[PDB]
Amino acid sequence: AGLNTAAKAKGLKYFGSATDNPELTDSAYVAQLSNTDDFGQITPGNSMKWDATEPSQNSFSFANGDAVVNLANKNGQLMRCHTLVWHSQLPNWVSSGSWTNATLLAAMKNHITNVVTHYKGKCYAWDVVNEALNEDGTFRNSVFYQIIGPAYIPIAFATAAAADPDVKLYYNDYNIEYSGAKATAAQNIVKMIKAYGAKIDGVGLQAHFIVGSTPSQSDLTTVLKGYTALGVEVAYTELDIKMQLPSTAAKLAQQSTDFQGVAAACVSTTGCVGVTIWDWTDKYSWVPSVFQGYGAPLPWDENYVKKPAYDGLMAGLGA
Numbered sequence: 430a431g432l433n434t435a436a437k438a439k440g441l442k443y444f445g446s447a448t449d450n451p452e453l454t455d456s457a458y459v460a461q462l463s464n465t466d467d468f469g470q471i472t473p474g475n476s477m478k479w480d481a482t483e484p485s486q487n488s489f490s491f492a493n494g495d496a497v498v499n500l501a502n503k504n505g506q507l508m509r510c511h512t513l514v515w516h517s518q519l520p521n522w523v524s525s526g527s528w529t530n531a532t533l534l535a536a537m538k539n540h541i542t543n544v545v546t547h548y549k550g551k552c553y554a555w556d557v558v559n560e561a562l563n564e565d566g567t568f569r570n571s572v573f574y575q576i577i578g579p580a581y582i583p584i585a586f587a588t589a590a591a592a593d594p595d596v597k598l599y600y601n602d603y604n605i606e607y608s609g610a611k612a613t614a615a616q617n618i619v620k621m622i623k624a625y626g627a628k629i630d631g632v633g634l635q636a637h638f639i640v641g642s643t644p645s646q647s648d649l650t651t652v653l654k655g656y657t658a659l660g661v662e663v664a665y666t667e668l669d670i671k672m673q674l675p676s677t678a679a680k681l682a683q684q685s686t687d688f689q690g691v692a693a694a695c696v697s698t699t700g701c702v703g704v705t706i707w708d709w710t711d712k713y714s715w716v717p718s719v720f721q722g723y724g725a726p727l728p729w730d731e732n733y734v735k736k737p738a739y740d741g742l743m744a745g746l747g748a
């Protein structure tokens with residue numbers, strides 16, 4: 430009947446979509462987001478990030494996150510909660526602060542414990558640490574790395590686990606879906622957290638790909654199995670496939686094949702729990718200025734009408 434029903438028949442927990450609060454006043458948008466034949470899971474695109482949830486020190490702000498949870502709850506959709514520790518979308522009080530190891534650890538832990546406690550029981554998964562690596566497999570020189578060193582990562586996981594022992598804890602990153610220094614480094618982060626004795630349940634593979642340059646089904650599956658071999662589940666967490674503009678029939682077809690292989694890779698991998706697309710309509714796709722010249726990244730167009738990629742996904746999920 431749709432993406433989510435097809436995904437569940439193949440043993441995934443969900444097929445899902447991100448959303449954001451500005452979209453929720455569009456009742457036509459909301460009606461399709463709330464269609465559980467297509468979406469059994471929701472991620473808040475922005476309203477659970479640090480800039481949204483602790484915009485001034487110790488000042489927790491949950492209304493916009495809660496509104497997304499409430500919608501998911503009314504619809505019977507799972508939540509993925511996104512994201513606790515990340516160098517981007519950090520309030521200036523954190524990124525510019527004068528810290529010591531103890532004082533930044535206290536503030537980071539305070540952030541995690543308050544946010545995760547607030548959402549205790551509501552989330553299938555948390556992206557606990559996001560994008561900790563540079564493209565060359567080095568640690569990003571974020572405030573957390575510079576002040577605390579690599580321990581910030583296992584400490585964040587341990588802190589999340591103490592606040593909510595049952596939610597699945599994910600390390601989430603992009604450009605780790607194909608082999609290379611970055612994916613190798615992401616494997617090493619998994620091994621490092623586990624060696625520290627902290628709980629890590631999952632690797633989140635964002636899957637921001639490009640039409641015509643998407644990794645093959647075979648390459649993607651191979652890489653997923655490289656993570657599951659470490660004793661984690663995997664999911665594609667932010668899938669979209671931006672195309673070099675203008676859109677053409679040939680690019681829409683390629684885009685369909687690209688989405689199909691991503692779905693098929695997940696369905697092929699024991700321990701891949703689901704796919705989330707980064708919103709579902711091109712009208713609300715994430716295409717910031719750095720990708721000027723690209724667009725139309727999603728399975729529905731800006732008029733909420735299906736593109737060939739929808740059928741591609743269905744084919745990849747075996748329906």
Ligand SMILES: *[C@@H]1O[C@H](CO)[C@@H](O)[C@H](O)[C@H]1NC(C)=O
Pocket residue numbers: 530531534576577578580
């Ligand atoms: C910060 O404190 C943690 C917790 O004890 C420790 O693992 C880490 O090495 C410390 N880092 C620095 C730079 O002191």
